[PDB]
Amino acid sequence: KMSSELFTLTYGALVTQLCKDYENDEDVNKQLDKMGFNIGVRLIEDFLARSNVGRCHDFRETADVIAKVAFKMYLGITPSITNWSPAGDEFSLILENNPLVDFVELPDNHSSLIYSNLLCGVLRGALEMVQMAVEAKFVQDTLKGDGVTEIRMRFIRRI
Amino acid sequence: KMSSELFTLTYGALVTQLCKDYENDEDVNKQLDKMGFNIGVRLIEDFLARSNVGRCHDFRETADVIAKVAFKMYLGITPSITNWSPAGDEFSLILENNPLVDFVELPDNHSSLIYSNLLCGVLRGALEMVQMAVEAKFVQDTLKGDGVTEIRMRFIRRI
């Protein structure tokens, strides 16, 4: 196990490089999400090998495992699961900080950048590989002056 | 604290992006080292705040702190310190794996890529900020079929 500061600074270098390569926040958002997807498709293999979940396609069990096991294992934090839809097909992950944003305050010119957008791709890619089509999106971000960071996750369909 | 697999895959995404941006292994090596330098100049502040070292410019004490505290804290591993020069101005860090290379075997066409070159920049940038000019370079790499990964560090001058 390792503390996170070298990880967060390395992620910072990646965002910096993408900003150099695209000079447009929406393009950066997109590339972070695509990279995250590729990471998630690989990361799920590590996770399933190390965990006790096996084969399952239950959305609530999935929320619990993501929040209480995967976030802890890979980011050192445990977000809360809140704000369930009536159908039980949508939930939020609530993070007290932004785990990738220790000490990285945004320029006012970059209001549209979703700095930690990689994480949405990772969630979507990982779950695709266990036959669950989901959408993950930031709806709050402490970097933008919100009181929490919130990732909203929606179950679309079984694959 | 967090396990390393999301960190190593994120670093992988960074190397991948640089390979797309440059298509030349030497250019990638250079950019990783430059990014590492920028990271090290920031990381040293985190480290000094969290540690008991204060103000010091002793090369052997520095080797010990790097190996036994900083590597453990930021990468979850403790390299050995070996192979001291007679003058005590050069030493090696010996790593049993490549910490950033879990599951990333190189193409034969990329023999010149120093995949984890970011780490050399981090070492040099961090030490510059405590007034020590050093050179850090990979001299062995498990990714290239060597039996260990070895980073050679040389003290140049006080700044």
Chain B interface, best mutation among A1, A2, A129, by max B CB count within 10 A: A2
- For the beta carbon of residue B81, count every other beta carbon within 10 angstroms: 17
Q: CA gyration radius for chain A? A: 15
Q: d(Cα A83, Cα B113) in Å, to the nearest integer?
A: 47
Question: In this complex, which of B6, B43, B76 lies closest to A5 when CB atoms are compared?
Answer: B43
User: From which experimental method does this structure derive?
Assistant: X-ray
Domain locations in chain B as residue ranges: 1-159
Pair B83, B92: CB distance under 8 Å: yes
The CATH H-level superfamily of B1-159 is Trafficking protein particle complex subunit 3 (3.30.1380.20)
Contact A39 B75 (CB under 8 A): no
Q: d(Cα B47, Cα B74) in Å, to the nearest integer?
A: 9
Describe the crossing of helices A25-50 and A5-22 by its angle, rounded to 10 degrees. Answer: 140
Q: d(Cα A72, Cα A103) in Å, to the nearest integer?
A: 20
Helices (H), A2-156: 5-22, 25-50, 59-65, 71-75, 118-128
- For the beta carbon of residue B68, count every other beta carbon within 10 angstroms: 14
Q: d(Cα A146, Cα B116) in Å, to the nearest integer?
A: 36
Q: Which residues precede gaps in chain A, with C-N > 2.5 A?
A: none
C-alpha distance across the termini of chain A, in Å:
34
